[PDB]
Amino acid sequence: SSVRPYLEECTRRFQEMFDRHVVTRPTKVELTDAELREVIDDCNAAVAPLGKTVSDERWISYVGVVLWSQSPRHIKDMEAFKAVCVLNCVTFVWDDMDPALHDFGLFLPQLRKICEKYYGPEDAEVAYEAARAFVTSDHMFRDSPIKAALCTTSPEQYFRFRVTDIGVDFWMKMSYPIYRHPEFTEHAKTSLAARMTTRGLTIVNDFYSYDREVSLGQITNCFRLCDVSDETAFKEFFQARLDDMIEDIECIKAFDQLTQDVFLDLIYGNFVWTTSNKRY
Amino acid sequence: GRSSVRPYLEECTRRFQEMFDRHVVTRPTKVELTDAELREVIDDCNAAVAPLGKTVSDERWISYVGVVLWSQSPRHIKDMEAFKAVCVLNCVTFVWDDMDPALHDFGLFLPQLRKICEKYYGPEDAEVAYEAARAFVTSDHMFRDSPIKAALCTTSPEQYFRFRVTDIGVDFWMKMSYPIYRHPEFTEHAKTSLAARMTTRGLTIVNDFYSYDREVSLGQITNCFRLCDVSDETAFKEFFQARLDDMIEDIECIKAFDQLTQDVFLDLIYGNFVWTTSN
Ligand code: NA
Ligand code: NA
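Above: the input record for the complex with sodium ion. Below: its predicted structure, written as tokens.
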């Protein structure tokens, strides 16, 4: 099965939706050559004990999601920003690895080292715990009956699983120190930030990963909840998902201005990055 | 505003019970506290709220603690120190929540919560429990008369329950209760909040039904029944059935978790209902 017939039309409709509902176009956070080299050197050091050597061009493709999905207008701590770059990137490499090579004994101390370098004492613990929780969860749900249950029952159960599994809770808990904004920090720490953004991130990620994921027997994709071969059923399901994104976006506008800027920059930025050629 | 669910009180109570009898089956049981343990719990609660100038009777503390005695899962308890912590944290947060918010002194109260966590938990768990407590009371203070609360609570059941994962206190509950069980799977679900996300609807629908009359008379909007017109029998019946269907879907999904975790989750939801109806 495949969403290839719908690829152009769904891309057009996603963009049209963001143009109408978010308006502010994503922009890319600027890293200096020195900052990017520091980010990459930390990524390399974190994954070396795992015997992984990764090219700059691969790291640069992983990091693009942070550069595009964060909110440059509101950045206050670039040390935190670099931490998110590193943590995102090394987590991508970890997720791309044969799980039989997952050595948590080697990896978790590296994640702690990154958090301690870039964050102050309390924020380091918060970011590390979120990272630890994410990678631990992933290891638990590999072929869990729970994963099967939540991902096949209904969109609501599926997105409930994905708040953690897509990594958005981790993302918010390592990102709030970038902004140093008290309200955002609380929504990140209660996970309301993650609960508000999960659908907009997951629906876009799922659409564009569907052909690959079903080909690999992966069940964490909301489009597996419809018959994509039936154009009628697909369109109906796709419209229902667009409607979910729009409901979330309109609710997000009730948050304070900076928080809403960050949430909408994340959802729209992730879309632009996902569809980018820099990422093909 | 002047509305009420009194006409449905008996029938809905009967249908909640029938639903739990069919879908959970295992009846709630109460955790036993010795006299000494209850005295220790009550002494810690009184100490925690003394800086706020609050005097609370033993009978009041015992009424609050009943939710912990009924909603935890006695077969699987391993750490009664953690269990005492949950009794104290639950009770003192009930008192804080019952106070006129103009008397909320965080500078006095937060250190008392930390004191409690440090006494009963190990280093790491004390921090996890304290953060969850801190986040919970900080959220409550944030969402008073906030546009966000209005939006989430009036938009759809989905947006409302998304807000209540934190606001009803279940994420806090899970993050202070996992040490009671020392069960690695449960500890992770509590830490990722999947535990809270799974149990939010069953706890919230029950609490909201039995608090509706009081909450609408106080202009509080955090109640899912405000999303339907409780004066229209037909609309109410329809909405009540959809909420039962929501509880059932969650319960059936919860049975995919490992046995101990599912026992804990289902004991929480069913035990909360028993305590709510006896209260
Ligand atoms: Na951006
Ligand atoms: Na019980």
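Notes for the reader.
Chain A touches chain B at residues 125, 129, 133-134, 136-137, 140, 145-146, 148-150, 153-154, 156-157, 160-161, 163-164, 169, 183, 186, 189-192, 195-196, 247, 251, 254-255 (CB under 8 Å).
The domain at 1-280 of chain A is CATH 1.10.600.10 (Farnesyl Diphosphate Synthase).
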